[PDB]
Ligand binder design. Structure first.
Ligand SMILES: NCCC[C@H](N)CC(=O)NCCC[C@H](N)CC(=O)NCCC[C@H](N)CC(=O)N[C@@H]1[C@H](O)[C@@H](OC(N)=O)[C@@H](CO)O[C@H]1NC1=N[C@@H]2C(=O)NC[C@@H](O)[C@H]2N1
Ligand SMILES: NCCC[C@H](N)CC(=O)NCCC[C@H](N)CC(=O)NCCC[C@H](N)CC(=O)N[C@@H]1[C@H](O)[C@@H](OC(N)=O)[C@@H](CO)O[C@H]1NC1=N[C@@H]2C(=O)NC[C@@H](O)[C@H]2N1
Lengths: 117, 63, 136
RNA sequence: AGUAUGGGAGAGGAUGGUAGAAUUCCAGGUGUAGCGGUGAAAUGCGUAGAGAUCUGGAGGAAUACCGAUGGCGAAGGCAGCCAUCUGGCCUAAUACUGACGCUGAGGUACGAAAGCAUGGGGAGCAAACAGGAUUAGAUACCCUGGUAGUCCAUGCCGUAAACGAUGUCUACUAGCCGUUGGGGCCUUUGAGGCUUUAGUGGCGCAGCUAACGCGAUAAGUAGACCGCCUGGGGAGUACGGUCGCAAGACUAAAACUCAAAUGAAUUGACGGGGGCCCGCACAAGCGGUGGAGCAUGUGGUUUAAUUCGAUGCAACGCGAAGAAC
RNA sequence: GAUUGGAGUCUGCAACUCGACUCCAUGAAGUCGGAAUCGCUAGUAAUCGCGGAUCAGAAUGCCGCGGUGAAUACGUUCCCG
RNA sequence: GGCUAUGUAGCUCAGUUGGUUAGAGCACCGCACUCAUAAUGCGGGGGUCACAAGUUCAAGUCUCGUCAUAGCCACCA
């Protein structure tokens, strides 16, 4: 119902899953899709293809809200960031900027123990 | 990063300028380092090995 | 072959039309060394299409094979020119068998005639291939 | 050996304040089916609305980049920034005292982490513990949680592969290349080049060593003083004693038993160590087997006997190129 | 073209257990085969027939012979040695 | 007595008001993978969907009754 022209794309990429959230500016969410939603259960969540599918779904859903140019922010390591941002452009959006915003501590809290596998 | 994109820049080329920006920044290296806690003994050993390797590289490139 | 690169085999043109495309199509049709039966089938099909429409068999066969020829295969990948002709002949062979004419030569002539105007089962197979291809 | 005066570098120590990033929790806005986790899963969280995203609060702990084979400290150790109190070191030239030195049994001070006592604090992490996995079993490694503890104040404990496995002090013995803090000299406008000194590194002549290796930061050549060793186990154990709230620490045997236990280096073998290449090994193709009926061999079962061998690849149309007698 | 009923030939002292072949009758499963797995780089694979050793008789096995006669190899990631 | 809710393989949960044209997970047995094993992958077997009738072109799936069970309530010969 509400019409916005400019938007923000948030990509939450990890070694386990990829979450794509489309917001307007000021951070109010409009649409979201994840690799878990489009099948790809379990270990299949982390492949770049699943991230691409989720990004395509989220972009198509946001197109109903009807915005044409968006700014993407990538937060996190792992596969699917590049595939997801490519899929957003391939849907027909104009990307205005692309930057990394993963949080980095200035030596804050202690991380968990190292895995002995 | 803040990779702003020109009128004639394609989407793929913009993303490519992006991974170069982020690879130059090296944030993913910090993310890799942060995920598990490393003991001070292991950190000291790693830095000692790095210093030895750097000096060997300097000697090799000088002669 | 790891190190060695092997040259592609060169086959002789067919004795009748001196066409390596016809020779290779005959080789695809032939089973267990019955080149005589393969020749009978292929030459009967060409004679049938020639009497149906007064057009040079070589030109008709090459035009139809170009029409059926795929630029991509089937999960999309890319193919080389040789694979294009190989897959075109491969798909053209089966539909004639599933047709219902009394002889294989008549069946294959009918299949070629139907694929030339686009209402062929091989054409449908190519359509499946490319409507699969746009998936990626 | 020490004192006065000028100058310099430093995560040296103690007290207080303060800044930014991030994690967790709380409230709210958008919004809707998943999130999280693994080799794969599951336990767990979520339609009384999670995860994601934005704004605002609470609290604790630690200080990204700089960062360095760098620096400081007797050792243990010390890293955001600012102020206060405070120790040592380096460097120049004069002046001053005139052997005032070195080492050090007993003694005494400090002394990582864990642990203990009293009172606080508690974000994250995490012994014990609970559950889910894996496994023949799993008490573990993996996963989801989680208490002591890790933090502060005041005390105790006195041990570490507390290591350079190398006690402190002094003098002498080729050279070459780095780096940190200073002094001097020379070019000539500003940045370079020579030296000298105190640290910190890489090679290396002589010498030394069983060898590996050390080699002006000696494991070389000599001197002063202290500590320690005398085959492997029993054993840093027992009894006695000192200290400690306790855990325990320190001092420290014998009976008995074996003919070895060790260090360095050499050849081979092995590795669920690495690198390199080839092969119808995989890819690309064509045709088969596993399904049916029958032939033949084997296992098993049965039998009076179903004669004996061959058993992963490398046994199974194999010895047998031919059992009605 | 399995199985079964009936009738025969030959080898052999002797075809019940337990031979091969011929004729009449009968006419089973089977309509292309799951997970998986095998061979083959050219006169090869595939397909068609012919011969021999053993041997009185008893090959779909073994060892040979010729006829017709293909498809595909971009490459070394992956699997095996 | 009144109101409700259930009864599906060797063991369990679906399938729930029409054309249900009963499946899913563990038990097995056989096969495959392995140097040997698992897990896993494949195949086969293992119920006849509480019973009895009614409508209907469609009934485990709906309507009537008869069982077994569970929950709450009511019972002054
Ligand atoms: N005046 C007061 C000054 C005080 C200050 N301390 C200065 C000083 O006095 N120094 C004296 C030098 C003695 C040195 N500590 C002995 C030594 O160096 N090795 C011990 C002898 C073992 C053996 N015979 C040789 C050996 O195995 N070597 C290895 C080897 O080359 C290489 O290992 C591998 N896998 O290839 C390398 C990479 O790690 O490690 C070396 N090993 C090590 N390198 C380290 C190092 O130098 N130190 C600390 C420790 O970590 C050392 N171990
Ligand atoms: C309070 N609720 C009970 C309490 O104080 N009890 C005793 C009591 O004061 C006294 O003993 C007697 N007199 O009975 C003392 C020694 O005499 O010891 C206390 N207890 C203790 N427990 C402690 C321990 O083990 N170490 C350290 C120190 O804290 C010890 N003192």
């Amino acid at each position: 119902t509400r019409t916005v022209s400019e938007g923000v794309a948030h990509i939450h990429a990890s070694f386990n899953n990829t979450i794509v959230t489309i917001t307007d500016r000021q951070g109010n969410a409009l649409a979201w899709a994840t690799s878990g939603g489009q099948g790809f259960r379990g270990s299949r969540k982390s492949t770049p293809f699943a991230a691409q599918v989720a990004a395509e779904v989220a972009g198509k859903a946001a197109l109903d809200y009807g915005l044409k140019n968006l700014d993407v922010l990538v937060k996190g390591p792992g596969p699917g960031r590049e595939s997801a941002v490519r899929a957003l452009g391939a849907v027909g959006y104009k990307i205005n900027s692309i930057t990394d915003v993963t949080p980095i501590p200035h030596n804050g809290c202690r991380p968990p123990k190292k895995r002995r596998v | 990063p803040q990779v702003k994109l020109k009128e004639g820049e394609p989407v793929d080329v913009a993303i490519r300028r992006f991974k170069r920006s982020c690879e130059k920044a090296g944030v993913l290296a910090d993310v890799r380092k942060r995920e598990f806690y490393e003991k001070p003994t292991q950190e000291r050993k790693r830095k000692k090995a790095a210093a030895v390797k750097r000096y060997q590289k300097k000697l090799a490139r000088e002669s | 072959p790891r190190r060695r690169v092997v040259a592609a085999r060169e086959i002789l043109p067919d004795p009748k039309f001196s066409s390596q495309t016809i020779a290779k199509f005959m080789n695809h049709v032939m089973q267990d060394g019955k080149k005589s039966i393969a020749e009978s089938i292929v030459y009967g099909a060409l004679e049938r299409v020639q009497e149906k429409n007064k057009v040079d068999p070589v030109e008709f066969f090459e035009t139809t094979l170009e029409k059926v020829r795929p630029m991509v295969e089937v999960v999309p990948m890319e193919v080389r020119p040789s694979r294009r002709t190989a897959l075109a002949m491969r798909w053209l062979v089966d539909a004639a068998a599933k047709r219902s004419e009394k002889t294989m030569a008549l069946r294959l002539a009918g299949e070629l005639l139907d694929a030339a105007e686009g209402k062929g089962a091989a054409i449908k197979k190519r359509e499946d291939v490319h409507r699969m291809a746009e998936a990626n």
